[PDB]
Amino acid sequence: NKEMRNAYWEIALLPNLNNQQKRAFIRSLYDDPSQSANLLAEAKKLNDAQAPK
Amino acid sequence: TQVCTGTDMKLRLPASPETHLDMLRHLYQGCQVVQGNLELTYLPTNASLSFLQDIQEVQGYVLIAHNQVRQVPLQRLRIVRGTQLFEDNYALAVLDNGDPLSPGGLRELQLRSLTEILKGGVLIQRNPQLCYQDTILWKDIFHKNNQLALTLIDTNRSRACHPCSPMCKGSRCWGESSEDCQSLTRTVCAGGCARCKGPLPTDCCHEQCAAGCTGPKHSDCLACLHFNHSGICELHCPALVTYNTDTFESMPNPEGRYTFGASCVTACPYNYLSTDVGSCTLVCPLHNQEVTAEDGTQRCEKCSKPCARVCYGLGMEHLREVRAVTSANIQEFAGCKKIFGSLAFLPESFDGDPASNTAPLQPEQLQVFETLEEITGYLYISAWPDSLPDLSVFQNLQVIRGRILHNGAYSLTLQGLGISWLGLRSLRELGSGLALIHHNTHLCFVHTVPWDQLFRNPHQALLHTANRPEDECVGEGLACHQLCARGHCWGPGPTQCVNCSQFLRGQECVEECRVLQGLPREYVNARHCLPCHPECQPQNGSVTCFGPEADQCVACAHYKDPPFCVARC
Ligand SMILES: *[C@@H]1O[C@H](CO)[C@@H](O[C@@H]2O[C@H](CO)[C@@H](O)[C@H](O)[C@H]2NC(C)=O)[C@H](O)[C@H]1NC(C)=O
Ligand SMILES: *[C@@H]1O[C@H](CO)[C@@H](O)[C@H](O)[C@H]1NC(C)=O
Numbered sequence: 001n002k003e004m005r006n007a008y009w010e011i012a013l014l015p016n017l018n019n020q021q022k023r024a025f026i027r028s029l030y031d032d033p034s035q036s037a038n039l040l041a042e043a044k045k046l047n048d049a050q051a052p053k
Numbered sequence: 054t055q056v057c058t059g060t061d062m063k064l065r066l067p068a069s070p071e072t073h074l075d076m077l078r079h080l081y082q083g084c085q086v087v088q089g090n091l092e093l094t095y096l097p098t099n100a101s102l103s104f105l106q107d108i109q110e111v112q113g114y115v116l117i118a119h120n121q122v123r124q125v126p127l128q129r130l131r132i133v134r135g136t137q138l139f140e141d142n143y144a145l146a147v148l149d150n151g152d153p154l155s156p157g158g159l160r161e162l163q164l165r166s167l168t169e170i171l172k173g174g175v176l177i178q179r180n181p182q183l184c185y186q187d188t189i190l191w192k193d194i195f196h197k198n199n200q201l202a203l204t205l206i207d208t209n210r211s212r213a214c215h216p217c218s219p220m221c222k223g224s225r226c227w228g229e230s231s232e233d234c235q236s237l238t239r240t241v242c243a244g245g246c247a248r249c250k251g252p253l254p255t256d257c258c259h260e261q262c263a264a265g266c267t268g269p270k271h272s273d274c275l276a277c278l279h280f281n282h283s284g285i286c287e288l289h290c291p292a293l294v295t296y297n298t299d300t301f302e303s304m305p306n307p308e309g310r311y312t313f314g315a316s317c318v319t320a321c322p323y324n325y326l327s328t329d330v331g332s333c334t335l336v337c338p339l340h341n342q343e344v345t346a347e348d349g350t351q352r353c354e355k356c357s358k359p360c361a362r363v364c365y366g367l368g369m370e371h372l373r374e375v376r377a378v379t380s381a382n383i384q385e386f387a388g389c390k391k392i393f394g395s396l397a398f399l400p401e402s403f404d405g406d407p408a409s410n411t412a413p414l415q416p417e418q419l420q421v422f423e424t425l426e427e428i429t430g431y432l433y434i435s436a437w438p439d440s441l442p443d444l445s446v447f448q449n450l451q452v453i454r455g456r457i458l459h460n461g462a463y464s465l466t467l468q469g470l471g472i473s474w475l476g477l478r479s480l481r482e483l484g485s486g487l488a489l490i491h492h493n494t495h496l497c498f499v500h501t502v503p504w505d506q507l508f509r510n511p512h513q514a515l516l517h518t519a520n521r522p523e524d525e526c527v528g529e530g531l532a533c534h535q536l537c538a539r540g541h542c543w544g545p546g547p548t549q550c551v552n553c554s555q556f557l558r559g560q561e562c563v564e565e566c567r568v569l570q571g572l573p574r575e576y577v578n579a580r581h582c583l584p585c586h587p588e589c590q591p592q593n594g595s596v597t598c599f600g601p602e603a604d605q606c607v608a609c610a611h612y613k614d615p616p617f618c619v620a621r622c
């Protein structure tokens with residue numbers, strides 16, 4: 001249960017994702033919580049890809 | 054219910070004009086006694102207002118302002134007590150009812166039953182079509198101590214008035230019709246009488262009567278000056294406890310009553326607290342502590358050890374004056390289970406204020422409320438960080454009591470938000486007050502919430518407009534999960550159901566537990582999947598374990614130290 005609420009905050013706080021992306025991830029998370037690890041990495045990879053340069 | 058709470062928005066324009074009329078209807082439908090103020094403002098010309106016809110008493114003041122309608126059906130209104138006054142002056146304020154440059158505007162007041170105003174004055178201004186107000190003898194309606202109440206009365210009109218029916222005692226009426234003659238009650242009495250029904254001495258009302266009567270008994274009053282003890286008007290309610298002289302102890306009075314508004318009462322109504330001092334209140338006094346009875350009843354009682362620290366919300370204690378939740382006060386809620394007061398999130402909450410240098414509140418900071426379970430007041434959200442798709446920070450919030458209401462009307466309000474769902478998945482009660490959810494463009498899952506189940510009295514309702522269209526939400530798969538009983542949920546996926554259809558694994562609603570198959574094997578209990586002990590040996594087609602412990606396995610994966618399974622001997 002704590003697994004979920006962490007992932008939520010994790011995604012919400014990533015500096016380089018815009019809100020739309022953050023929603024997509026959070027939504028998919030709420031749809032299937034077991035994917036939190038997969039979605040979490042997915043979101044971090046894109047966050048780093050969009051890092052300001 | 055004969056009793057209802059009024060409002061408190063005065064001349065402010067309605068938050069939701071599309072729902073305003075409907076709101077009023079839910080508020081005053083069949084209501085007879087208005088705890089607080091009866092505010093009737095911005096009513097459009099053809100508006101049906103018959104829901105007001107039962108009202109006899111208004112505790113507060115009456116405000117009839119900025120209306121287009123031609124009449125307000127208040128013929129039964131008998132007494133306004135003036136517990137609060139509009140602008141601390143007026144018990145009755147009739148302002149600005151007339152077209153803003155066939156014609157609209159109030160035409161007659163028609164308050165033919167209005168014979169007692171305990172406290173406060175009268176203000177009647179800028180009503181182009183209004184007649185007969187200059188005609189009324191106000192000092193008769195005013196209570197004896199009220200003679201001097203101030204009375205500011207504009208007369209400019211845009212039409213000539215017909216004369217008061219020849220039938221009227223003076224030439225004094227509340228309108229054209231002959232039913233509309235002001236009945237005089239205080240000024241026309243034999244001897245120094247308070248109130249009377251006629252010129253004769255035996256027509257004088259009882260000392261406890263308020264507007265008038267139909268007989269000399271305290272059972273014959275048109276209103277109670279002090280308290281309504283089951284038809285009888287009285288100075289006090291029969292006290293809760295009697296001292297016995299033949300035993301020198303105080304055994305409770307079986308006749309004991311509680312003072313509710315202006316009526317004596319057996320027990321307090323639903324959302325109210327019962328005090329030692331014998332009253333029903335929405336707040337405990339100093340040194341007094343809120344205690345839930347084993348049933349559900351709430352009570353105030355004296356603290357044995359000086360009362361323990363407690364979280365105060367906006368509108369309370371040192372936050373009495375404070376308008377919103379900000380970076381300056383967010384900490385005061387750190388790990389509170391219960392907030393005595395309310396919470397508001399306004400734009401200024403989220404874009405800070407350099408003038409005070411208060412920093413903009415940061416999304417992560419909202420995590421202090423993750424433990425919150427109860428709010429005694431209200432919850433008002435007109436701004437929410439766009440990076441959060443729902444209100445899950447309030448995931449564990451169970452009750453909003455509504456003992457204090459935003460604008461004296463609303464216990465829960467969400468407007469202009471941009472959240473996609475709610476996520477208030479523990480919310481099971483709105484103690485009192487109306488709910489309002491509107492102008493949230495992306496908001497789904499409003500229809501899927503059983504508002505019905507959350508309310509507690511029949512003057513409550515959910516007003517809503519301008520959210521995300523419902524069939525747009527379904528197109529996007531934003532509806533309740535397969536597994537949510539009766540199709541109620543707070544949002545998307547299987548962690549959002551109100552009641553789960555099959556079984557729960559923690560918070561997640563799931564079809565089958567893992568009894569016969571699945572990585573970590575489970576036993577079942579009260580519809581909850583729970584894990585077999587790590588030392589248990591998984592089974593093919595048969596059951597794996599019968600409970601949490603090591604003695605409950607069907608086989609061990611390591612070593613048996615009877616009756617347990619270990620990794621030891
Ligand atoms: C005081 O309370 C009594 C009883 O609680 C009120 O009497 C009720 O009045 C309503 C409408 O006015 C009737 O429909 C009920 O049938 C009455 N109930 C009973 C038990 O008689 C009474 O009107 C209240 N106010 C005053 C001034 O007496
Ligand atoms: C009802 O209100 C409308 C709109 O203001 C007005 O045009 C119309 O005359 C009214 N109808 C009746 C039947 O009174």
Ligand SMILES: *[C@@H]1O[C@H](CO)[C@@H](O)[C@H](O)[C@H]1NC(C)=O
Pocket residue numbers: 590591592593
């Ligand atoms: C059950 O069968 C599986 C796979 O066919 C096997 O790996 C396992 O050893 C068996 N377990 C028991 C308790 O017989």
